[PDB]
Design a protein around this ligand. Structure first.
Ligand SMILES: CC(C)CCC[C@@H](C)[C@H]1CC[C@H]2[C@@H]3CC=C4C[C@@H](O)CC[C@]4(C)[C@H]3CC[C@]12C
Ligand SMILES: CC(C)CCC[C@@H](C)[C@H]1CC[C@H]2[C@@H]3CC=C4C[C@@H](O)CC[C@]4(C)[C@H]3CC[C@]12C
Ligand SMILES: CC(C)CCC[C@@H](C)[C@H]1CC[C@H]2[C@@H]3CC=C4C[C@@H](O)CC[C@]4(C)[C@H]3CC[C@]12C
Ligand SMILES: CCCCCCCC/C=C\CCCCCCCC(=O)OC[C@@H](O)CO
Ligand SMILES: CCCCCCCC/C=C\CCCCCCCC(=O)OC[C@H](O)CO
Ligand SMILES: CCCCCCCC/C=C\CCCCCCCC(=O)OC[C@H](O)CO
Ligand SMILES: CCCCCCCC/C=C\CCCCCCCC(=O)OC[C@H](O)CO
Ligand SMILES: CCCCCCCC/C=C\CCCCCCCC(=O)OC[C@H](O)CO
Ligand SMILES: CCCCCCCC/C=C\CCCCCCCC(=O)OC[C@H](O)CO
Ligand SMILES: CCCCCCCC/C=C\CCCCCCCC(=O)OC[C@H](O)CO
Ligand SMILES: Nc1nc(NCCc2ccc(O)cc2)nc2nc(-c3ccco3)nn12
Ligand SMILES: CCCCCCCC/C=C\CCCCCCCC(=O)O
Ligand SMILES: CCCCCCCC/C=C\CCCCCCCC(=O)O
Ligand SMILES: CCCCCCCC/C=C\CCCCCCCC(=O)O
Ligand SMILES: CCCCCCCC/C=C\CCCCCCCC(=O)O
Ligand SMILES: CCCCCCCC/C=C\CCCCCCCC(=O)O
Ligand SMILES: CCCCCCCC/C=C\CCCCCCCC(=O)O
Ligand SMILES: CCCCCCCC/C=C\CCCCCCCC(=O)O
Ligand code: NA
Length: 390
C-alpha cells in the first residue's frame, strides 16, 4: 500500500481549500445582512446563524477533521470533543433550516399576524436556545455514550499512547448506534422529513390561495354576464348577491380599501334597485362596476398574485438549500448505516470515507452561491460589497 502521507496530503489540501471558501462566502453573507437593511428581517437572522455555523466549519471543524485523520494519541474525552464538535454545527444548521421553513409557512398562512408573532427579539431567543440544544445533542457522547470504556488496546499500544489515551479515530470512540439511531434517524432524518412536509404545505397554501383569487375574479366577471342578459329583477338579485359575498370575501392599502368600498357600494346600489323591481336601472348600475374593476380590482388581483408568486419562488430557493444539505450529508449517514446494520458487508473503503467527509464539508460552501444566484437582494448587495472593496 502507498505511503499514507500521499493520500493524506490530498485530503488535507482539499480540506483547506474548502475551509477557505466556506469562510469567505459566509463572511460575505454576514457582511451583506449587516450593511443592507432590506436583508435585515427575521428570516435572515436564521440565515446568519446558519452562516456562522458554516464559518465555524472552516475555522474549527475542518482543522479538527484534519487532526483526527492522523489517529494521534489523545485523552479519550478530548478526542471525543474533536470528533463530535462538527455534530454541534450540523445540528445547529438543522435548527436554522427548520426555523426558516416554519417562518415562511407562518408568513404565507397568516401574513397579517406575522409581524406581531415573529419578531427579532423572539428569533434571537430561539437561536440562542437552539445553539444550546445543538451542543447538548452533538456532544452527547461526552456525557457517557462513547467507547472510551472499551479502548482498542491493539491500536493504543502500537501507537505508543500514554495512560488513559487512545488512538484518536472517529469510529473507535463514537458509537455507531449513536450515529445511526440518535444522530441520523432522530436528530437529522426526522427534522428533514418535517421540513419537507412544511415546504409541501407552503406550496399547497400558495396554490390554494392563488386559486381563490382567480375564482373570486371569475365569479365577478361571470355574474356581470348574468346581469347583462337577465330577463327580470330576480335574476339580477341572485347574481348580485353572489358578487357581494365574493366582494367582502376578497376584502378579508389606502387605494385598496377605497376600491372595495366603491365596489361594495355599487353592488348595494344595484341591489336596492333590483329589490324595487327596477330591472334596466339595476343592470345599468351594475354595469358601472366595470370601471371599478379595471381601475382598482384588477390592480389588487395582480399585486396579490405577484406577492404569492414571489413567496413560491423564495420558498423554492430555500428548499434547494435543504436539498443540498441532504445531498451533502446523506452519503456519510448512509455509509454508517451499512457499517452498523450489515456486519457481514465489507467496510466502505477509506477513499470513500474521506470523499463522504469532504462532500459533507462542501455544504458549507454552497449556500452563498444559492443566495447569489436566486435572491436578487443578496446578489446586488454582494456586487456592491465586492466592487467597493475587493
Ligand atoms: C475558541 C477556539 C478558538 C479555541 C479552540 C480550542 C481547541 C483547539 C482546544 C480546546 C480543547 C482542546 C482539546 C482538549 C483535550 C485534548 C486531549 C489531549 O490529550 C490532546 C489534545 C486535545 C484533543 C485538545 C486539542 C485542542 C482543543 C480541542
Ligand atoms: C444521497 C445520495 C447521493 C446517496 C448516495 C448513495 C451512496 C452513499 C451509496 C450507494 C451505493 C453504496 C455502497 C454500495 C455497496 C457497498 C459495499 C458494502 O460492503 C459497504 C458499503 C458500500 C460501499 C455502499 C456505501 C454507500 C453507497 C456508496
Ligand atoms: C433519506 C431517505 C431516502 C431514507 C433514508 C435512507 C436509508 C435510511 C436507507 C436507504 C438504503 C438503506 C440500506 C439498504 C441496504 C442495507 C443492507 C442491509 O444488510 C442492512 C440495512 C441497509 C444498510 C439499509 C439501511 C437503511 C438505508 C441506508
Ligand atoms: C469562528 C466561529 C464563529 C464565527 C461566527 C461569526 C458570526 C458572525 C455574526 C455576523 C452578524 O452578526 O451579522 C449579522 C447581523 O448584523 C444581522 O443583524
Ligand atoms: C470550541 C469553540 C467554541 C465554539 C465557538 C463558536 C461556535 C459558533 C457559535 C456562533 C453563534 C453565532 C450566532 C449568531 O451569530 O446568530 C445571531 C443572530 O443571527 C442574530 O442576528
Ligand atoms: C482560530 C482558531 C484556530 C483553532 C486551532 C486549529 C486547530 C486546532 C486543532 C489542533 C489539535 C492538534 C493536537 C495535536 C496533538 O495533541 O499532538 C499530540 C501528539 O501525540 C504529540 O506529538
Ligand atoms: C470561551 C471559553 C469557552 C471554554 C472553552 C471550551 C472548550 C473546552 O474547554 O473544552 C474542554 C474539553 O472538552 C476538555 O476535554
Ligand atoms: C424517519 C424515522 C426513522 C425511524 C426508523 C425506525 C426503524 C428502526 C427499526 C430498526 O432499525 O430495527 C432494529 C433492528 O434490530 C436492527 O438490527
Ligand atoms: C424520534 C425517534 C426516531 C429514531 C427511532 C430509532 C429507533 C431505533 C430502535 O428502535 O432501536 C432498536 C434497538 O436498538 C435494536 O437493538
Ligand atoms: C425511515 C428510514 C427507516 C430505515 C430503517 C432501516 C432499518 C435497517 C434494518 O432494520 O436492518 C437491520 C439488520 O438487517 C439486522 O440484521
Ligand atoms: N463514520 C465516520 N467516520 C469518520 N472518520 C473516520 C473514517 C474511517 C473509517 C474507518 C477506518 O478504519 C478509518 C477511518 N468521520 C465521520 N463523520 C461521520 C458523520 C458526521 C455526520 C454523520 O456522520 N461519520 N464518520
Ligand atoms: C469534493 C471535491 C473532490 C474531492 C477530491 C478527492 C478528495 C478526497 C479523496 C482523498 C482520498 C485519500 C484518502 C486517504 C486519506 C487519509 O489517509 O487520511
Ligand atoms: C465562496 C467564495 C467566494 C468568496 C467571494 C470573494 C469575496 C471575499 C471578501 C469577503 O469575504 O468579504
Ligand atoms: C488566531 C488563532 C490562531 C490559532 C492557530 C494556532 C495553532 C493552530 C494549529 C497548530 C497545531 C499544532 C500541531 C501540534 C503538533 C503536535 C506535535 O508537535 O507533535
Ligand atoms: C495554514 C497551513 C496549514 C498546513 C496544514 C498542516 C498539516 C500538517 C499535519 O497534518 O500534521
Ligand atoms: C482562520 C483560522 C485558521 C486556524 C489554523 C488552521 C491551521 C491548522 C490546521 C491544521 C493543523 C492540524 C494539526 C495536526 C494534528 C497533529 C498531528 C499529530 O499529532 O500526529
Ligand atoms: C492560524 C495560523 C496558522 C499558521 C500556521 C499553522 C502551521 C501548521 C503546522 C502543522 C504542524 C503539525 C505537525 O507538525 O505535524
Ligand atoms: C462518486 C464515485 C463514488 C461512488 C460510488 C462508489 C461505490 C464503490 C464503493 C467500493 C466498494 C468496495 C467494497 O466492496 O467495500
Ligand atoms: Na452547515
Amino acid at each position: 500500500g502507498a505511503p499514507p502521507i500521499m493520500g493524506s496530503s490530498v485530503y488535507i489540501t482539499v480540506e483547506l481549500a474548502i475551509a477557505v471558501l466556506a469562510i469567505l462566502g459566509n463572511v460575505l453573507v454576514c457582511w451583506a445582512v449587516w450593511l443592507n437593511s432590506n436583508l435585515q428581517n427575521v428570516t435572515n437572522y436564521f440565515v446568519v446563524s446558519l452562516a456562522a455555523a458554516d464559518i465555524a466549519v472552516g475555522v474549527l471543524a475542518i482543522p479538527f477533521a484534519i487532526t483526527i485523520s492522523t489517529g494521534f494519541c489523545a485523552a479519550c474525552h478530548g478526542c471525543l470533543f474533536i470528533a463530535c464538535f462538527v455534530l454541534v454545527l450540523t445540528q445547529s444548521s438543522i435548527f436554522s433550516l427548520l426555523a426558516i421553513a416554519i417562518d415562511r409557512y407562518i408568513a404565507i398562512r397568516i401574513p397579517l399576524r406575522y409581524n406581531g408573532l415573529v419578531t427579532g427579539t423572539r428569533a434571537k431567543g430561539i437561536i440562542a436556545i437552539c445553539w444550546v440544544l445543538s451542543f447538548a445533542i452533538g456532544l452527547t457522547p461526552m456525557l457517557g455514550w462513547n467507547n472510551c470504556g472499551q479502548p482498542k488496546e491493539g491500536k493504543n499500544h502500537s501507537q505508543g499512547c500514554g495512560e488513559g489515551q487512545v488512538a484518536c479515530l472517529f469510529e473507535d470512540v463514537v458509537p455507531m448506534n449513536y450515529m445511526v439511531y440518535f444522530n441520523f434517524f432522530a436528530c437529522v432524518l426526522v427534522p428533514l422529513l418535517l421540513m419537507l412536509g412544511v415546504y409541501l404545505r407552503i406550496f399547497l397554501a400558495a396554490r390554494r390561495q392563488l386559486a381563490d383569487l382567480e375564482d373570486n375574479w371569475e365569479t365577478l366577471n361571470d355574474n356581470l354576464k348574468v346581469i347583462e342578459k337577465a330577463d327580470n329583477a330576480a335574476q339580477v338579485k341572485d347574481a348580485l348577491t353572489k358578487m357581494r359575498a365574493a366582494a367582502l370575501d376578497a376584502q378579508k392599502m389606502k387605494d385598496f380599501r377605497h376600491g372595495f368600498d366603491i365596489l361594495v357600494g355599487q353592488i348595494d346600489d344595484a341591489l336596492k334597485l333590483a329589490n324595487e323591481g327596477k330591472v334596466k336601472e339595476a343592470q345599468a348600475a351594475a354595469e358601472q362596476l366595470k370601471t371599478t374593476r379595471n381601475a382598482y380590482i384588477q390592480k389588487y388581483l395582480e399585486r396579490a398574485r405577484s406577492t404569492l408568486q414571489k413567496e413560491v419562488h423564495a420558498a423554492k430557493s430555500l428548499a434547494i438549500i435543504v436539498g443540498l444539505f441532504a445531498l451533502c450529508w446523506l452519503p456519510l449517514h448512509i455509509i454508517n448505516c451499512f457499517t452498523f446494520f450489515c456486519p457481514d458487508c465489507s467496510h466502505a473503503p477509506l477513499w470513500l470515507m474521506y470523499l463522504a467527509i469532504v462532500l459533507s464539508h462542501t455544504n458549507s460552501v454552497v449556500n452563498p452561491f444559492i443566495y447569489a444566484y436566486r435572491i436578487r437582494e443578496f446578489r446586488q448587495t454582494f456586487r456592491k460589497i465586492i466592487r467597493s472593496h475587493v
